[PDB]
Design an enzyme around this catalytic site. Structure first.
Site, PDB file in Angstrom:
ATOM      1  N   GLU A 236       0.771  -1.252   0.000  1.00 54.59           N
ATOM      2  CA  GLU A 236       0.000   0.000   0.000  1.00 54.59           C
ATOM      3  C   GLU A 236       0.807   1.311   0.000  1.00 54.59           C
ATOM      4  O   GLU A 236       0.717   2.095   0.951  1.00 54.59           O
ATOM      5  CB  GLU A 236      -1.001  -0.015   1.171  1.00 54.59           C
ATOM      6  CG  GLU A 236      -2.003  -1.164   1.070  1.00 54.59           C
ATOM      7  CD  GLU A 236      -3.179  -1.069   2.032  1.00 54.59           C
ATOM      8  OE1 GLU A 236      -3.253  -0.107   2.816  1.00 54.59           O
ATOM      9  OE2 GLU A 236      -4.046  -1.979   1.999  1.00 54.59           O
TER      10      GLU A 236
ATOM     11  N   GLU B 218      -5.040  -8.509  -0.429  1.00 54.54           N
ATOM     12  CA  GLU B 218      -5.794  -8.299   0.802  1.00 54.54           C
ATOM     13  C   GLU B 218      -7.252  -8.110   0.457  1.00 54.54           C
ATOM     14  O   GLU B 218      -7.588  -7.331  -0.445  1.00 54.54           O
ATOM     15  CB  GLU B 218      -5.336  -7.053   1.566  1.00 54.54           C
ATOM     16  CG  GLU B 218      -3.938  -7.126   2.151  1.00 54.54           C
ATOM     17  CD  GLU B 218      -3.633  -6.007   3.132  1.00 54.54           C
ATOM     18  OE1 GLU B 218      -4.582  -5.311   3.570  1.00 54.54           O
ATOM     19  OE2 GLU B 218      -2.432  -5.828   3.470  1.00 54.54           O
TER      20      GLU B 218
END
Length: 316
Positions: free
Chosen positions: A133, A245
């Site tokens: 991220e 995820e």
């Protein structure tokens, strides 16, 4: 679809503690944790690690103990016939400074991946998760950094699969969202791999703002809906996707959404290559809505009754 698995959270936590102390501030999984998830027909563990624990100094040697812990994780996974994604779980920062800053030039990121690539060179069990991220680096600057690390990895001769995220928390739903006009949809289109063995890593949560803050899901179809434009983007740009995820709480609506999203990926396997649930690991609190770590009696968590048969269709 080749990969179905789970994030084993534990080695990345309490990041204020550098180096931190093993088995107090953070942990690696026990060998039987891999066996459990393999028994549920998963073939993949995503393993978050902290850059600063693995490489305490810019351009320096990898920490011997941390590297041995990752080697043990890979060995444990292999014993359970599983793959391991080594996830540098760092939000494109090294000691709080963003990659591309004067403090942390691209060269610093390249050196980490050169050393990791050498350590696990062409070991087919090991997948390279470039960065978790990236978010306060704009998509075009991130793509340049990602490209540099991909090139560095390939220059070592390593043939491993690489998972390449976009920026803006690499959300599937926000692929066309902009920072000063720049988007993952533009920036990541030009990503290349000298060995052509990579996938675009996306994350996706099903709560109100896709942050995975809440255990509720917006609708029975919100997963599919939030993957749709990303999926067609992959198809147009001749790329593959890994949903590294995603998670959903234990509710009737979430169960429909989860099932649908997993079915959608198998129906679009020309572009979707794998997924990994967030999360399991021995230190999650009892209130954590996405936790699929078995309880003290060894009993499965609710969401596993959906994840396991979907994983089985992929792995059997």
């Amino acid at each position: 679809l080749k990969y179905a698995g789970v994030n084993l959270s534990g080695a990345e936590i309490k990041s204020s503690q550098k180096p931190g102390v093993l088995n107090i501030d953070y942990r690696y999984p026990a060998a039987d944790e891999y066996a459990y998830f393999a028994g549920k027909h998963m073939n993949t563990v995503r393993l978050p690690i902290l850059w600063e624990r693995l490489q305490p100094r810019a351009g320096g040697e990898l920490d011997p103990a941390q590297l041995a812990l990752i080697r043990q994780a890979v060995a444990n996974a292999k014993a359970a016939k599983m793959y391991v994604i080594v996830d540098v779980h760092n939000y494109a920062k090294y000691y709080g400074h963003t990659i591309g800053s004067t403090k942390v030039p691209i060269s610093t990121f390249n050196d980490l991946w050169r050393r990791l690539a050498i350590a696990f060179k062409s070991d087919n069990a090991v997948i390279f998760g470039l960065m978790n991220e990236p978010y306060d680096i704009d998509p075009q600057a991130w793509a340049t950094a990602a490209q540099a690390s991909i090139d560095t990895i390939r220059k070592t001769g390593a043939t491993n699969l690489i998972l390449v995220p976009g920026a803006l928390w690499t959300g599937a739903h926000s692929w066309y969202s902009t920072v000063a006009g720049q988007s993952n949809a533009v920036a990541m289109a030009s990503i290349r791999d000298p060995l052509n063995r990579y996938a675009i890593e996306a994350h996706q949560y099903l709560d109100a703002d896709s942050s995975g803050t809440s255990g509720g899901c917006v609708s029975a179809t919100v997963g599919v809906e939030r993957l749709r434009s990303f999926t067609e983007w992959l198809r147009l740009n001749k790329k593959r996707g890994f949903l590294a995820e995603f998670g959903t709480g234990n509710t009737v609506t979430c169960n429909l959404a989860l099932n649908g999203m997993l079915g959608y990926m198998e129906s679009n396997s020309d572009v979707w290559m794998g997924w990994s649930w967030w999360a399991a690991g021995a230190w999650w609190s009892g209130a954590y809505p996405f936790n699929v770590q078995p309880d003290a009696q060894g009993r499965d968590k609710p969401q596993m009754s959906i994840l396991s048969p979907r994983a089985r269709r992929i792995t059997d």
